[PDB]
Amino acid sequence: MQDTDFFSWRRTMLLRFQRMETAEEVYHEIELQAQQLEYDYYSLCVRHPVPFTRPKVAFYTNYPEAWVSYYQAKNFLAIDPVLNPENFSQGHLMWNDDLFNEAQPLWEAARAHGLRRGVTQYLMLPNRALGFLSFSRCSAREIPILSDELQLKMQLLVRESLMALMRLNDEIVMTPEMNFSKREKEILRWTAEGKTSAEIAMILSISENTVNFHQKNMQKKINAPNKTQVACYAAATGLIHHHH
Amino acid sequence: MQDTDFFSWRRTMLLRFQRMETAEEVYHEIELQAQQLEYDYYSLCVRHPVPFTRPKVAFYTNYPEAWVSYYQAKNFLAIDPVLNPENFSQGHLMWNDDLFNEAQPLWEAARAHGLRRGVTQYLMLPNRALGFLSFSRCSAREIPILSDELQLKMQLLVRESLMALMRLNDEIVMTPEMNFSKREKEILRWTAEGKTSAEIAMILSISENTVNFHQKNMQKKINAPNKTQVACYAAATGLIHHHH
Ligand SMILES: CCCCCCCC(=O)OC[C@@H](O)CO
Ligand SMILES: CCCCCCCC(=O)OC[C@@H](O)CO
Question: How many helices (H) and strands (E) does chain A have?
Answer without folding.
Answer: 9, 5
